[PDB]
Symmetry: D2
Subunit: 242 residues, 4 copies
């Protein structure tokens, strides 16, 4: 009766701090990656190895998603928390009309359809448990369905994800399952993998992966069962999409 989390892309960026947060809480974790970074994580947590499982996976591929669920279930028997931390991002700034079909598809499959696929696998398990926490990621300002100049596909996929988070919240509330979204603001470079303490050492201090990690950790608690369908902005009042 130790709760189990499944987190996509949890060895780098924001997802690394999320993983470290849940382990620190006593949770067991399945972490996906898409390899030297994973190996250093595995080594850092040598002494708690039974509570940490690594699986290689491309979240745009249905089969790989089926396999991370199968491997989590095989070793742990349960999935209590699904953190859809993985979010393929086209860093290039260009207009929708200039998008390659490969880029469009990567955004949609990577950010919206990957979540559908996962849910299709994980919701039934959560129903059997009468417990589930789904955490999706948005971007700042997401709940207002905004356009994002030069981020067409990403924004479209994530805004669509907003709708989906909400629908899943209403459809699965019956079964002890909550679905929420966290929106990180502009957390840049080294600060993605950094702690609050570190940012505070140097508007104000930079936002960090820990800021996200502590918000996700709060939504995953047993007594957060009434918080569902909500979008938590963790941006420190710093505008991104404008």
């Amino acid at each position: 009766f130790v709760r189990h989390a499944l987190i996509t892309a949890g060895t780098k960026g924001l997802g690394k701090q999320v993983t470290e947060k849940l382990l620190a809480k006593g949770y067991s974790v399945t972490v996906t990656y898409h390899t030297t970074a994973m190996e250093t994580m595995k080594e850092t947590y040598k002494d708690v190895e039974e509570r940490l499982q690594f699986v290689q996976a491309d979240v745009t591929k249905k089969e790989d998603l089926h396999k991370i669920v199968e491997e989590a279930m095989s070793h742990f028997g349960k999935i209590d928390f699904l953190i859809n931390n993985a979010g393929p991002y086209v860093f290039e700034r260009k207009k929708l009309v200039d998008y390659e079909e490969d880029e469009w598809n990567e955004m949609i499959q990577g950010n919206l359809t990957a979540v559908f696929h996962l849910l299709k696998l994980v919701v039934p398990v959560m129903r059997k448990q009468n417990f589930g926490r789904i955490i999706n990621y948005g971007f700042q300002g997401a709940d207002s369905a905004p356009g994002w100049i030069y981020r067409s596909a990403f924004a479209a996929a994530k805004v669509g994800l907003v709708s989906l988070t909400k629908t899943v919240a209403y459809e699965e509330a019956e079964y002890g399952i909550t679905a929420n979204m966290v929106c990180p603001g502009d957390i840049i470079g080294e600060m993605k993998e950094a702690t609050i303490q570190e940012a505070r050492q140097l508007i104000g201090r930079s936002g960090t992966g820990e800021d996200i990690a502590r918000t996700i950790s709060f939504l995953c608690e047993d007594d957060s069962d009434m918080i569902t369908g909500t979008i938590i902005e963790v941006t420190g009042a710093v505008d991104v999409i404008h």
Copy 2:
């Protein structure tokens, strides 16, 4: 020197009234039809007198190849695309939770309502830039602008809510070129009312295709160039999604 429109699925339902409106305003139209040859046949004969202004093209608008064909055929006969009216869009009539969706169902919704638009924009927007004139019309649903959940409609809500954001993004990206992009949200106009006129509703008030069509033709007007990125609801204050 007269304005040409491209309307997907323009011989049935809402599209029928939209096509009838634009023809009545003096516009030329390329209309697409999937399967129903009978529909396009009775619109053929109705408009024999204005044969020169009207053109039927068979197309499955979920197929990239067919999307290229309609654009190539409109450009062939009329040399321009002034208005793009994305009237087509698959709809799953069965009410079912997302966790019950077959992969094929999910993909039809995304591909038909979101990705197909991207594919059309990709073809038609370059032509509009050249023209220094464009009117893009997309369809949503009541309340879409707030990115809501919609129980039993997860895939459709998600795809149209992503389309809300896409519509606004395209509006920001293409404003320099004299191109507007807007969304019309029909209410739950059921059945024969979709191709009825307002006068026909007043004799029987219900919403109709005309209510939608006259909104679209207001937006396609030349002096409507400052209206862009807006989601106009034509519902009559009547909740659909709760």
Copy 3:
């Protein structure tokens, strides 16, 4: 049986173009002001005096609001369109906590409570008519209930007004009354009173852009359009 519009602050700014629009459409109009702009307008439409009436009013004063309704009804016997074009605005950029109590109250009273007062008078008239068009103004992005740095009070009252336009659309639908909001972007200076043609020769949004949206919402066959917010910003961010 010619339709009648009541427009607040319709002698200058955006309101001016809206008045001129409805007049051109063949309508009759009661315009408020809170003076030489009224006289120049009064001079321009000497020919059609019968269709244009001017009433002085402070929109933040409930007594004046009752007076405009009375005067319109005495003269015309009906109110078909209500266009709440007036909207005091604090042009200074100060943080919320720097507001004087009088500044706060002007924004709330001027932008939210004024509309309630007017609706309270005009709605019964519209129900009896089985017809009404209520038009409110917001600002760009208002539909998302956004904050607005240095425009706290204005934004709060205008965002509240969004809620109000929607509630009134639902509550009054059964009487042939629609309520809709128009949100203009940054129309600055002369462009507020400008025509679309003029702008094309100098494009900045104009008062006529707002006017033609309002005119379309006011048509007999726009009965199905209600509780909507229509942005006429031309894809220019204002509030960020």
Copy 4:
């Protein structure tokens, strides 16, 4: 060096649970009460052993003079105001259309839900600035974030939706000073369940004051400083406003 909270209407309903939570978290609290004196005497009995961290002040929150009184009383005893929990909220229980509103009913809704907050912020924000620390908590209703209409609740909806905006504005203007401002939206929590613990509700699930209380609790934390301008729904995926 214990953090001080000021909470309007904190001896009854949701307010009571929030008050009990903050006490359990080690904080001192100034709680305001309007009419009922028996309720505040009973709470004052319950917490005899922590009298020093609990101050009661009589106040009508719709009166500017009483607002100065509570801030003044708080500063006198504690020398600081760390959290402002605007729990009070006048509510017209009678379900009527806007046109049937008395000039006086409208005015109480605005004055009590919106202007009252402004007056308090006018008094408390400058204290927070000097401390370089602040947590502002306002209340909304389910779905307030999308500025909806609410039939038969027009004045309350309008005042609460205006408050949404005010909250975000305060958040952007005051981030420099380490002040955050957030909204919590309770769903329909009924009667006794307002003063109930989550624990009580399980042994009966219904939402409680404790569900709201623990959210505020989380938002007041020192490490919650990157969460600002966010509207958190603690509904339970139960729609009320339709």
